[PDB]
Each structure stands twice: as structure tokens, then as C-alpha cells.
């Protein structure tokens, strides 16, 4: 075993500069390889090697499948250049497509992870704003957002109420009010008797002024030094309907109504109770923001990611110096972008915001696609490329194919994109054709428009490094290679076929390379190619013509050709032993044929 810990003498001589390198040989760093494979060092004691991949909840194939399929169904192909350019369709109700997918998931998502609910929340908020009479439109958006807020808190509110046991107007009523469901809240308030609310459901009208008069009465009571010996937080709840989020009373008590509420509910309360029934979302957002930014107490709660909430950083005497490094949930930034065009898209699109690990990028990528489709492209080319690459890498880590190809193809740079996809193909392509491989190839060719010639070129690279001649040559056939193919066949296949009497194959290959342009470009084409072609053709024609009444013109042609063939057999160059044998065989055969031809002509 390597010595446990000798780090003194050898360290002093390790700082020596005569051969610091030789003294620093003990070192090692072998990093990566294809598909994130990690090589490393460390009963024999030597070196070990283990894989490396994204193992966090590594079993979700179906989801990948569904949204990826939806994306392809919504994308357009532009084959203007050699490398196609896929572009998303501009705002084709993609947000609706995503919500449907989330609902389909919800059928069997009762027993899934927490990331599912995070994503659901994110997408539905995106829908309630940017989903897409100005006043009427704003009011409808407000109603939808209210529905979302109520729905997302519904479960929590129901759990809380069950815990209350005998209800208390101090807490029970607070929870009901912030979570809506006023129709059931009235049933809960029957202990004292309250049906003016039924009278309200009948005519939803003048609520503003009613509540304002209630507030006036309350503030009169407050200034009159009364309304003090009543229940402590009953007064807290009265201040809520009044419209004061923080009340400093005569006893110097800081009555914070906004306390015990998570950031979302705090903003919601500001929208309905504190602000008038006719208001714009932006103003409310800004007010809430200033609320936790102090004035004067910070009565609102900081927008925290759903996973970082547990341990709100201990703001011991210095809260601000930490807030300037803490992230905020995607929803806030979505609202800000919905209002104005001055914000860092990069912060908004950070994997950590939704899921702690920095390796999951599905949501981020789909959100970037939606943002591109909403005419919001402030993102720099560098970051776009980085995102695409990381997503493709995650895909490859699991083991995906054409979808990573499509992600690569959204990069708006022709050469770079093409090279990337080519490299990807070469590394993953398998020479052994399988049902799955064939399916993938068909997909690529019939959906993403790629060539089978490129597929065969990939196969030929593999079958050249360590592969066999047969497969290499087959793949080169359809790969439109002239010089290399020519060389290959002349050296090995040719003589083998001569001695195995298989010329039909040799001839197909050689004639496909004899076409006007091909023959022009192929080097040494004239020499060897012509030689072999002539041999085969001469045999065949001799046989046929002898049987077919020996046509004289064809006989003359054969004579000319055989003379030319003699002229070339002598010039055959020898580099190997097979060349000699083949040469001799050909010479013998041609001499016999020549004799037969002379016999059938002159005599």
C-alpha cells in the first residue's frame, strides 16, 4: 500500500527546485471520458474505477417522453442550409399544452417527488399572467390569479383547520380569511350568527365602502382608548379588515397582522385588504417588496425558494448583506418580467431556484423556449449555448438520442451546430444494426431530416479503427467515397473474388465508380479499375457472343479490348504477394481468351 502519511523530509525535498517534478511524481489526475465516465485511482492495493452520473431520482422516463414529444409537435423545420434549423413556433398556446401535461401527471402524481409540485406551481403561475377593454382584461387576470392563490393554499388551509380543534376567532378566522372560502367561513361563524354575508353573495356590491366604514369605526375605537380589554388577536383581526398591516398601539405594542404568513400570502393580503378593489398588480408587488425592505419595521416576509425556507438565515444584526446573495423563486421574476423589460433573465433561469441540485435542467430549458416564444430574448448567446449543451449532456447521461439532437439544432450557428451533431453521431452510433437503432435512424431521417450517408460515414469511422473490412466497405459504398474505396477493393477484395469466381459483386462496385464524373475524379482509376472491368467484361462477352451467332462487330470490339488488357497486365505494380498471384492468373486467362479469339476470327 502507498505509505499512509510521510510528509516532512520528503516535503522539504519536495520544495526543492532541482527536480521538483521528479519529487512530484507521486501525483495523479486522470479526469473524464465519453458519457461522463470518470477514471480515477484507488488483497492487492492498486487502482479502481467507477462510473459517474446523475443519480438523483434517476427513474422518470415517461415525463421526458411526454413534454419532448409535445415540443416536437409544436416546432418548425427550416432546411435552408446543409444543417437544418429548428425554431419554436411563436406563442402557440404552449403554456396551455404544459398545464394539460401537468394535469395528466396529477392523475398518478400522488405518489411522486416534491419537484413535481414545484414545477406545477411555476407553470400555473406563468399561465395566470403571461398565458394570454383593458380594465376588463386586467380584472380577469386578477380573478385568475386569485383563483390560483386560493387553490395553491387550499390544501394547507384545510390541514390547518383540522388541527385547530375547537375553533378560535383569533386564529381560525385569520386562516379562513387569508385562504378565502368565505362561503364556508360564514357557516363557521354561525356560533355568533351571521347572515349579512348571504345578503352579500346575493348582491356582490359596495363591499369597499362597507369595509371602509367598518375600518372607520375600528380606528375611532382605537383612538378612543377603548377596544383594549377585548381579546388580544381579535383586535389583530379587526386591524386586518381595517387596512393597517402594522399597528403601534398606546401600549407600544407592535401589532403585526402580516406575521405568521409566507411571502405569497403576504402579497395577497396587500392586494385585497390593504389596497382598493381596483388596483394594478405591479403597484402591489412593489409595495410588498418595499415592505420586507424596511422603512418602520420589515413586516413582510422575504421571497424564499420553497426548499430554503426551513432555515431562514439567522439575520443577526445584518440581514441585508445576506439577502444580496440569496435567490428568489422563479415566480417573482416572472411577475417582474410580465410588468417590465428590465431584469436579469439569467437569475430567473437558474436550476437551483426550483431544485437544489445544479444538474436538473428540464424546467429551465422549457421555460427558455416559452420566453423565446414570448418575444423576450435578452439572454446572451453564451448562456443559451451553455444551457443547450448541459441539457443535451443530461440527456446523454441517462441515455437519450434524437431529442438531444433537436436541442443541439436550436443553436442559431450553422457550422457549430453541424459539427456538434456530427460528433455526437460518431460517438453513439452502433455498427450492429438493431431494431432500436433502426428506429432511431428512421426518426432522425424522417423527422429531423438527417442523411443516411452521414450515418454510414459514422459506421465507417468505427469499422476502421477496430472494425472489419467487409462492413467498412459496405458502409463506404453508400458513403460516396472514391479514392479510399478504390484502394481498399483493389488490394484485398479483388484477388479474393478472382480466385472465388465472384465477379457480379466486383463489377457492380467497379461500374458505379466508372461513371463519367466519378472516373474523372478517382485517381489510378484508369489503371486498376479499367484492368478489372475489362477482365470481367471480356469473360462475359466472350461467352455470350460465342453462343449468340458470333456477331462480328462485337468480336472486333472484344479484340480491341483484349489487346488493351494485355498492354495493361504487364504494367501491374506489385507491393504484396497477392498482387503477383492475381497478376499471373489474369495473364494466363487473357492469353487463353486471346488464343480463342484469334482462332474464331482469322481461321
Amino acid at each position: 500500500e502507498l505509505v499512509p502519511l510521510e510528509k516532512s523530509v520528503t516535503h522539504g525535498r519536495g520544495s526543492l527546485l532541482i527536480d521538483m517534478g521528479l519529487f512530484m511524481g507521486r501525483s495523479f489526475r486522470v479526469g473524464w471520458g465519453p458519457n461522463w465516465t470518470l477514471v480515477h485511482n484507488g488483497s492487492p492495493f492498486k487502482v479502481h474505477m467507477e462510473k459517474l452520473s446523475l443519480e438523483q431520482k434517476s427513474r422518470e422516463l415517461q415525463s421526458y417522453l411526454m413534454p419532448l414529444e409535445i415540443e416536437l409537435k409544436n416546432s418548425s423545420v427550416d432546411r435552408s442550409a446543409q444543417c437544418p434549423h429548428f425554431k419554436p413556433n411563436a406563442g402557440v398556446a404552449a403554456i396551455h399544452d404544459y398545464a394539460g401535461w401537468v394535469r395528466n401527471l396529477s392523475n398518478e402524481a400522488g405518489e411522486l417527488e416534491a419537484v413535481v409540485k414545484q414545477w406545477g406551481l411555476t407553470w400555473t403561475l406563468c399561465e395566470s399572467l403571461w398565458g394570454q377593454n383593458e380594465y376588463v382584461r386586467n380584472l380577469e387576470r386578477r380573478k385568475a390569479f386569485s383563483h390560483w392563490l386560493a387553490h395553491t393554499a387550499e390544501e394547507r388551509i384545510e390541514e390547518e383547520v383540522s388541527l385547530y380543534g375547537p375553533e378560535r376567532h383569533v386564529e381560525a378566522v385569520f386562516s379562513f380569511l387569508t385562504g378565502g372560502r368565505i362561503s364556508d367561513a360564514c357557516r363557521l361563524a354561525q356560533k355568533s350568527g351571521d347572515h349579512r354575508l348571504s345578503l352579500l353573495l346575493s348582491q356582490m356590491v359596495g363591499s369597499q365602502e362597507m369595509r371602509e366604514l367598518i375600518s372607520l369605526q375600528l380606528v375611532d375605537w382605537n383612538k378612543l382608548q377603548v377596544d383594549h380589554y377585548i381579546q388580544e388577536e381579535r383586535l389583530r383581526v379587526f386591524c386586518l379588515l381595517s387596512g393597517t398591516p402594522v399597528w403601534r398601539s398606546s401600549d407600544n405594542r407592535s401589532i403585526n397582522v402580516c406575521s405568521q404568513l409566507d411571502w405569497k400570502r403576504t402579497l395577497a393580503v396587500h392586494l385585497w385588504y390593504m389596497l382598493p378593489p381596483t388596483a394594478t398588480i405591479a403597484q402591489a408587488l412593489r409595495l410588498y417588496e418595499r415592505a420586507f425592505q424596511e422603512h418602520g419595521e420589515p413586516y413582510a416576509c422575504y421571497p424564499l425558494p420553497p426548499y430554503l425556507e426551513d432555515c431562514s438565515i439567522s439575520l443577526g444584526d445584518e440581514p441585508s448583506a445576506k439577502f444580496s446573495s440569496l435567490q428568489r423563486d422563479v415566480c417573482v421574476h416572472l411577475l417582474k418580467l410580465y410588468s417590465e423589460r428590465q431584469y436579469d433573465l439569467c437569475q430567473l433561469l437558474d436550476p437551483s431556484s426550483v431544485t437544489p441540485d445544479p444538474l436538473d435542467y428540464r424546467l429551465s430549458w422549457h421555460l427558455w423556449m416559452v420566453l423565446q416564444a414570448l418575444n423576450y430574448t435578452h439572454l446572451s448567446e453564451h448562456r443559451q449555448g451553455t444551457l443547450h449543451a448541459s441539457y443535451a449532456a443530461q440527456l446523454e447521461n441517462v441515455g437519450l438520442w434524437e431529442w438531444a439532437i433537436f436541442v443541439l439544432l436550436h443553436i442559431p450557428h450553422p457550422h457549430i451546430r453541424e459539427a456538434g451533431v456530427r460528433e455526437l453521431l460518431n460517438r453513439q452510433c452502433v455498427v450492429r444494426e438493431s431494431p432500436e437503432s433502426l428506429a432511431k435512424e428512421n426518426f432522425l431521417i424522417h423527422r429531423l431530416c438527417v442523411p443516411a450517408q452521414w450515418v454510414h460515414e459514422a459506421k465507417a469511422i468505427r469499422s476502421r479503427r477496430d472494425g472489419d473490412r467487409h462492413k467498412e466497405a459496405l458502409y463506404l459504398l453508400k458513403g460516396h467515397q472514391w479514392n479510399p474505396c478504390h484502394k481498399l477493393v483493389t488490394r484485398h477484395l479483388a484477388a479474393d473474388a478472382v480466385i472465388n469466381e465472384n465477379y457480379r459483386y466486383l463489377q457492380s462496385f467497379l461500374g458505379e465508380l466508372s461513371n463519367p464524373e466519378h472516373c474523372k475524379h478517382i485517381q489510378d482509376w484508369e489503371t486498376a479499375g479499367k484492368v478489372y472491368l475489362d477482365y470481367i467484361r471480356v469473360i462475359d462477352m466472350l461467352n455470350l457472343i460465342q453462343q449468340d451467332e458470333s456477331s462480328g462487330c462485337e468480336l472486333e470490339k472484344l479484340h480491341t479490348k483484349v489487346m488493351s488488357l494485355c498492354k495493361w497486365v504487364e504494367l501491374i505494380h506489385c507491393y504484396t504477394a497477392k498482387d503477383r498471384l492475381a497478376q499471373s492468373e489474369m495473364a494466363k486467362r487473357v492469353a487463353n481468351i486471346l488464343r480463342v479469339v484469334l482462332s474464331l476470327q482469322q481461321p
Binding site: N483, P484, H486, K520, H521, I522, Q523
Partner: protein, 395 residues
């Protein structure tokens, strides 16, 4: 600058008062002045160098028009201008007539070969050269003598290292690399006495020696071929020797343009026909062809020279081949030019040559010279080309 129509029109017009000779003269002069004015203002920045490269490539169209002009002019003048008329006096010879006179007979005799020789002459006339006093070619390799660094090390001809392997020194090795680069440049350009002036003012024993002969001789050439075949000599020098021998190395011939490798293959055809010519004119001795096969006595014909020069090492069609102005001058030299005129006129009609702002007017002026000097190209092609050019230039 946009008025490149006016100069061509004024030349064809004053030549419509004048001869064909001054016509082609003014055409080449105009193309030259045009490219030169183009390169007048081409300013580069580290990035701006890329745009200036695009501009020099664009003006390289005017460059190729200038080259096609000079080539077509000299070739047509040799074809049609009376300079082909003389007695068989240069082709008179006897048994005691020297190889000089046998070569004179070949030179007055062979039309195709002499045309190929003029072709090589054009290859050399269009010369790209590294400067003497401004390039490390010899401006830095102007030492008192060659291998002065090696000599100093030893203290502390090409026969020398060929015999003794390891000794050589790297400073002089690099100096010789740059020198031989200069020499391949200058001689493949054909500035032979200037290359000799270099070999002398530097004093490179092997350079002067290997290249001092004024003109058996077959033995000498076979010997040169064998020495080029030998190892251990520099890249450009190896190519220089193989070429002056009648064989091809690759080291510097790795850097042969379509026209440079054309010079190579045409010189190969001409040298092979020259050797077969002397062999027929048996004047040369038997022991002179000491290594018969190691020299290629047989010649390639013009069409095969062109096919080989066009076929790219990637088993492809050459880019300089697919270029048109080069292809145009090529058909003009190869004398398969009326076919190409028909190809371009039908190209306009099938959807080719349309986009190019020059190629139309180029075809116009070229057919103008061709026909007006001699009635070869037909008036049908003439009218189609002239009318398309007329509509374009009217616009």
C-alpha cells in the same frame, strides 16, 4: 469604379477604329489597372484584415480576368497571328548535328508540344515571389558562407552530410530551409539567373554545382532523378531537383496551384515527348539511359494532363477548376472553347451564370475578341449573350 463598362466599351470602340492586337492589349491593361486600383485602398485591422481578405478575393476576380486576358491574348496570337510561318530550316538536321540542332528541329516541329511549352512559359510569367531584401529567404540567410554556425561548432558540399549523417547544425539547417524555400519559389517562378544570383551572393556550393549546366545528357538527367530519389536533401531543394530532372517529389510540390501543377504535368508531357524525340532521333547514347524505367519516357496527352490537374487529392473536382475565369482561359488554351461558349450561353438559359455581375460582360468582350479577330463563334450565341448583357448594362 462602377464604370467598368466604359473602359471596355472605349477599347472595343477605338479598336472598332483599330486592330485586334491593340484591342486585346487594352483589355489586359484595363483589367490590370482595375485590380491595381482595387488594391490601392485595402486597409486592414486585426479583425479588419478579414474584410480586406474578402476585398482582395473579390478583386481577385479582376485579377483572374487580367490573367485570362493575358493568356487568351498570347495563345490566340500564337494560334492566328502569322508568327507560325517559317521554313523547315530549324527542323533541318544531320548526323553530325548536335543535340542543340536536334532540339531546334523538335522546337520548330511540334505544334502541340511548343504550345505546351508556351503554356509553361505563362505559368512562369504569372509568378508569385518572395522578395530578396525584405524576406528571411536570404535577407537573413545572407551569412558570410553557408553553415557558418556548423563550422564554428566543429571548431569548438551536399556530399558532406550525405556521407556523414549526424553532424549537421540546426541554425544552418533552418537558414537552409528558408534559402531552399526562396529557391523553389524563384525558380518555380522561372527567374533562373536571379536564383543563381542568390546561390552566388550567398555562395551555396551545392546550389551552384547542382544547377550550373547550360543544357550523356540523358545520363545526367537520370542521375539527377536518382539523387532526387535519394533521401536527406531538403524539401524545396528535393522538389527542385526532381523537377529539373523530369520527376515529381511532393515536398514543395505539396504547394502546387492548379496552374502550378498544370506547369508540372505539362512539363512532364513535354519532357517525356522530348526524351522519346531524342530516342527516335537516336543521337543520344545507350549507356546514357542507364536507368530506363526510373524515368518516365512515355508522355501524357493534353486531355489526361487536364484530367489529372483537375482531379483533387480528395477524389473530387477542384475548386480552382470549378472557378470560371480560370476555366475560361483553360478552354481558350485547350482550344475546346466554342463548346464552353455554348455551355455559358445555355447556362444563362438554364439558370446559370445569372448572378455574377461580371461573367456576362466577360463573355461579351471575350466573344467580341474571338469573333472580330476570326469568325468562329456563331452569331446566335453572339446575339443571346449581347442582348442579355445589353439589358443588364442598360439597367
Amino acid at each position: 469604379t462602377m464604370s467598368m463598362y466604359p473602359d471596355f466599351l472605349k477599347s472595343f470602340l477605338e479598336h472598332p477604329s483599330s486592330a485586334v492586337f491593340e484591342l486585346i492589349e487594352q483589355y489586359e491593361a484595363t483589367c490590370n489597372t482595375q485590380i491595381t486600383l482595387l488594391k490601392k485602398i485595402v486597409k486592414r485591422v486585426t479583425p479588419g484584415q478579414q474584410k480586406f481578405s474578402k476585398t482582395a478575393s473579390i478583386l481577385w476576380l479582376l485579377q483572374q480576368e487580367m490573367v485570362t486576358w493575358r493568356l487568351i491574348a498570347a495563345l490566340y496570337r500564337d494560334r492566328i497571328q502569322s508568327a507560325l510561318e517559317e521554313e523547315n530550316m530549324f527542323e533541318i538536321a544531320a548526323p553530325n548535328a548536335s543535340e542543340k540542332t536536334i532540339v531546334d528541329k523538335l522546337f520548330q516541329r511540334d505544334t502541340l508540344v511548343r504550345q505546351s511549352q508556351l503554356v509553361v512559359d505563362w505559368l512562369e510569367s504569372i509568378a508569385k515571389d518572395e522578395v530578396g531584401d525584405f524576406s528571411d529567404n536570404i535577407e537573413y540567410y545572407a551569412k558570410s558562407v553557408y553553415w557558418e554556425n556548423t563550422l564554428h561548432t566543429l571548431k569548438q558540399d551536399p556530399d558532406a552530410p550525405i556521407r556523414q549523417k549526424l553532424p549537421l547544425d540546426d541554425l544552418d539547417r533552418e537558414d537552409d530551409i528558408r534559402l531552399l524555400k526562396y529557391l523553389f519559389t524563384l525558380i518555380r517562378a522561372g527567374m533562373t539567373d536571379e536564383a543563381q544570383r542568390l546561390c552566388k551572393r550567398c555562395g551555396q556550393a551545392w546550389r551552384a554545382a547542382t544547377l550550373e549546366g547550360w543544357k550523356y545528357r540523358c545520363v545526367w538527367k537520370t542521375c539527377c532523378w536518382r539523387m532526387a530519389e535519394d533521401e536527406q536533401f531538403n524539401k524545396y531543394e528535393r522538389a527542385i531537383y526532381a523537377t529539373l530532372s523530369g520527376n515529381l517529389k511532393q515536398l514543395l510540390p505539396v504547394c502546387e496551384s492548379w496552374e502550378d501543377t498544370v506547369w508540372a504535368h505539362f512539363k512532364v508531357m513535354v519532357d517525356s515527348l522530348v526524351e522519346q524525340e531524342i530516342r527516335a532521333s537516336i543521337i543520344s547514347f545507350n549507356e546514357a539511359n542507364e536507368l530506363p524505367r526510373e524515368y518516365l519516357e512515355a508522355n501524357w496527352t493534353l486531355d489526361s494532363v487536364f484530367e489529372e490537374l483537375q482531379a483533387t487529392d480528395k477524389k473530387r473536382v477542384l475548386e480552382e477548376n470549378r472557378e470560371h475565369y480560370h476555366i475560361i482561359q483553360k478552354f481558350v488554351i485547350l482550344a475546346d472553347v466554342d463548346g464552353l461558349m455554348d455551355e455559358f450561353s445555355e447556362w444563362l438559359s438554364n439558370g446559370k451564370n445569372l448572378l455574377l455581375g461580371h461573367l456576362l460582360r466577360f463573355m461579351t468582350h471575350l466573344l467580341l475578341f474571338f469573333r472580330t479577330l476570326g469568325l468562329q463563334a456563331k452569331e446566335e450565341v453572339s446575339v443571346e449573350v449581347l442582348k442579355t448583357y445589353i439589358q443588364r448594362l442598360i439597367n
